[PDB]
Design a binder for this molecule. Structure first.
Ligand SMILES: C=C(C)[C@H]1CN[C@H](C(=O)O)[C@H]1CC(=O)O
Ligand SMILES: C=C(C)[C@H]1CN[C@H](C(=O)O)[C@H]1CC(=O)O
Lengths: 185, 146, 122, 47, 41, 94
């Protein structure tokens, strides 16, 4: 027979599972449309807490010296690992490090300055990328001998070029303009 | 005399560089930048690649600076325009201008391909919390109709 | 403060162009209805100023670099920006509460239907 | 040398977003007005 | 025949409604995955 | 009627085909969401910068000279790839 209570209960439940399945279709459609993937190593703390994924820097430079002179817990732990890692985790050149990432089968992580990383991220076959924010804030500068006559003009020159936005334009010229993969069946 | 180092895309050799001479056989960011700096200061310049092919570093036991900074301190070059990181150890022996480019140490990794969803990923559009709750409501309706 | 207050009292009709630092600060402050969008229009920085040709210039310069390399500046920023943040500080694509309230209205249905049944047999 | 690096940015107002009501919102409260008036309006016809 | 076509057209009715719901909700969650990039705007 | 074995069979099957049709609707909606997006054009100028797909002009004519004599950031880059491309990307006829 037909009962009113069971009818309206069945109705509310029907509306319920309706909301449920519509939400399911919606969320799955979203997952497939955007196809966002979770970062394999997201935090910089994810490299220090695991020994499975190797990570290293150049055999010489400001980055290696940054890990050498670091008192930070994570970065100090990372340096402690990198100095004790066998086989050698350090590379001689940037191209060697990149080649080690691509030939490592994803077992090697390359710690490099954001600039070259942004450059190589724009180079074929575009299988590399930068993850997470920068570990520190530094900059490149035009060097002159101590007490040089060129120091004052180069200092004023850099600021002049920067404020008129030529540095950003030139950077776009050599990085993102000629970049193979731009703008991120 | 402008000292620099071959590093992409800061300073690169042109394809036709064998038939070219002077500063016309070099190209990159630091090249255009050097042109601009030289134009603002109004001086003629000559682009030279660093001899040992290194950056500024002091050896512990000998106390001798190598690379471009070494070429600046020892008077082998008059200016260094290259992707040279401004550091304290370098600033003590030479003078740095204001940063013409800002950067930081980052992580370069290979793009991972998405792992197979399996039995627990198709569930994700309906949360585990929602599975437990839809089951609680499942047995909560079947108990009322009971 | 006037710019921020004009954004908040503008009802979203006013946009405030300011340095990224202060914007990151205000993004952490109650009522917490404001945010920074897009990357910076340029790259600048703050510096310790000294009179031209001062005896104090070189040591403060090397001091700044010294503090910067040992990472004290960033810790100090985390201290005055992100440590006390009222807005900031469980992020997933799905939250049950959208599909969950129907559980509650369903319970309303179960209780009311049960009730009318009870008054039907009474 | 810069002890803090920054840049000119844009501050905009983003409103805070917040149940059964939320599941009712794509219906926009107007399903209770239209679909229910049509519900009792069909059930009265069948009546 | 009357109640039959009434129930049928009503079926189509609630069908279109729930379809519109599922479609709109799909837009909601897809937009949720989506973000709000240029400062030149 | 209320037969429990067959009932739970019908329920689990209902849920099964439910998840399936939801997946189809979702995938078709996503597909049709991707289809109408902007194709590379000035991004084909970015695609000209992608090397997976070869692209070229006639071995002689006004188009090739348009790329040779170009000072534009894009078209000149395109010429830079095409003249140095292995294998040869130019054709003799249309
Ligand atoms: C490319 C090299 C070896 C140089 C360039 N800048 C950094 C520097 O000035 O130390 C070095 C890279 C690094 O240290 O990772
Ligand atoms: C159709 C051909 C081969 C001719 C016609 N006009 C161009 C010319 O004046 O050379 C050529 C086409 C081209 O170069 O794309």
């Amino acid at each position: 027979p037909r009962s009113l209570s069971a009818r309206i209960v069945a109705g509310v439940w029907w509306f319920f599972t309706l909301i449920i399945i519509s939400s399911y279709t919606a969320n799955l459609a979203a997952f497939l449309t955007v196809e966002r993937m979770v970062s394999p190593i997201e935090s910089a703390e994810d490299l220090s807490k695991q020994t499975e994924i190797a990570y290293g820097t150049l055999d010489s430079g400001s980055t290696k010296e940054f890990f050498r002179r670091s008192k930070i817990a994570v970065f100090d732990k990372m340096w402690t690992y990198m100095r004790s890692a066998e086989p050698s985790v350090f590379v001689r050149t940037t191209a060697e490090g990149v080649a080690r990432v691509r030939k490592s089968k994803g077992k090697y992580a390359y710690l490099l300055e954001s600039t070259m990383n942004e450059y190589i991220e724009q180079r074929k076959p575009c299988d590399t990328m930068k993850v997470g924010g920068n570990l520190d804030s530094k900059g490149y500068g035009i060097a002159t001998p101590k007490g040089s006559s060129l120091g004052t003009p180069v200092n004023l020159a850099v600021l002049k070029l920067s404020e008129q936005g030529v540095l950003d334009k030139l950077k776009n010229k050599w990085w993102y303009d000629k970049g193979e993969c731009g703008a991120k069946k | 005399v402008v000292t620099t180092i071959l590093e992409s895309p800061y300073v690169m050799m042109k394809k036709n560089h064998e038939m070219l001479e002077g500063n016309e056989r070099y190209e990159g960011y630091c090249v255009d930048l050097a042109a601009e700096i030289a134009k603002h200061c109004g001086f003629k310049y000559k682009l030279t690649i660093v001899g040992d092919g290194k950056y500024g570093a002091r050896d512990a036991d000998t106390k001798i600076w190598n690379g471009m900074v070494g070429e600046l301190v020892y008077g082998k070059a008059d200016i260094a325009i290259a992707p040279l990181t401004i550091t304290l150890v370098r600033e003590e022996v030479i003078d740095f201008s204001k940063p013409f480019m800002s950067l930081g140490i980052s992580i370069m990794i290979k793009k991972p391909q998405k792992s197979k969803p399996g039995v627990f990923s198709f569930l994700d559009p309906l949360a585990y919390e929602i599975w437990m709750a839809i089951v609680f409501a499942y047995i909560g309706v079947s108990v009322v109709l009971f | 403060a006037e710019g921020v207050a004009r954004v908040r009292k503008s009802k979203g009709k006013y946009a405030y162009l300011l340095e990224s630092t202060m914007n990151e600060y205000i993004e952490q402050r109650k009522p917490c209805d404001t945010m920074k969008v897009g990357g910076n229009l340029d790259s600048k920085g703050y510096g310790i100023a000294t009179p031209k040709g001062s005896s104090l210039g070189t040591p403060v310069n090397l001091a700044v670099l010294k503090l910067s390399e040992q990472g004290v500046l960033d810790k100090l920023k985390n201290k005055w920006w992100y440590d006390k943040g009222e807005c900031g500080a469980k992020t997933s694509a799905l939250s049950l509460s959208n599909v969950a309230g129907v559980f509650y209205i369903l319970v309303g249905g179960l209780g009311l239907a049960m009730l009318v049944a009870l008054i039907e047999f009474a």
